[PDB]
Amino acid sequence: DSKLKAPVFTVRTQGREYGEFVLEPLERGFGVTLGNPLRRILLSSIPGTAVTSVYIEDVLHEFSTIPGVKEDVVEIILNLKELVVRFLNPSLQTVTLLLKAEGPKEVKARDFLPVADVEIMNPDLHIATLEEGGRLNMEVRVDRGVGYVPAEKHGIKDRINAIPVDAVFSPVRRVAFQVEDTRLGQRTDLDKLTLRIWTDGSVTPLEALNQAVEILREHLTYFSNPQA
């Protein structure tokens, strides 16, 4: 019949950072109808974790340099904005990571002290270079949220000398969808939709996809009880 049956779903994944989700066969024009709303939701409305405040001992502001440390605080904070932290506890909202290093060494993201139900997804991230006689004792605060919150908005300081950090909470890095010409039976105008999702690893592409579907699904329930 003209009523096209339920499509077959197809999932292909490469670790925790890439995923391909194929949905075919669809009616003509439903590739863009379904793909784009998901892409917009994926790129903006997927909760994640970010560094929101960093405290470095003996440092008052971010416009200073640390003796024995090759980078200044501005460059260190830029490196911290690339840190990927995955909370294994759905109820966990905030965590403070402690780093205590002495030169001569190259301090990576794997130098943070371990925390319960917290995992660093990129231990090889380079934070600072320590020369002999240099010390780096800093506390990094990692929060959970959505979107992009500039440090001027939240202004989170765990203590007096803490430095607020612009937070980019979105775990999704890149989204693209491809519409191919698939044919079922005698109908040759059908669509094949392929969502390609790139994540930082804290949230798998499948988890991000499921959240995006739920966000769209919940928004569709706002058309139920008209106020007139």
Mask 203-222, x = binds a second copy (CB under 8 A)? ---x--xx--x--xx-xx-x
Taking the C-alpha atoms of residue 181 and residue 3, their distance in angstroms, rounded to an integer, is 18
Using rule CB under 8 A, residue 175 touches other proteins: yes
Residue closer to other proteins (CB basis): 18 or 92: 18
Taking the C-alpha atoms of residue 108 and residue 86, their distance in angstroms, rounded to an integer, is 17
* One residue of 14, 15, 36, 178 binding a second copy per CB under 8 A: 36
Sole window of 16-24, 103-111, 113-121, 181-189 interacting with other proteins (rule: CB under 8 A): 181-189
Using rule CB under 8 A, residue 171 touches a second copy: no
26 contact partners, CB below 8 Å, separation of at least 6: 4, 7, 34, 190, 191, 192, 193
Using rule CB under 8 A, residue 23 touches a second copy: yes
Using rule CB under 8 A, residue 4 touches a second copy: no
Count residues contacting other proteins (CB under 8 A)?
34
* One residue of 123, 133, 150, 155 binding other proteins per CB under 8 A: 150
* One residue of 57, 58, 81, 88 binding other proteins per CB under 8 A: 81
Out of a second copy, other proteins, none, what residue 5 binds, judged by CB under 5 to 8 A for its kind, is none
Cα-only R_g, the chain: 23
**Contacts to a second copy by CB under 8 A:** 2, 6-13, 21, 23, 26-30, 32-34, 36-37, 40-41, 44-45, 145-146, 206, 209-210, 213, 216-217, 219-220, 222-228
State the residues that interact with other proteins by CB under 8 A. 28-29, 32, 35-36, 39-40, 43-44, 62, 74-75, 77-79, 81-82, 147-148, 150, 166, 168, 170, 173-178, 185-186, 188, 196, 198
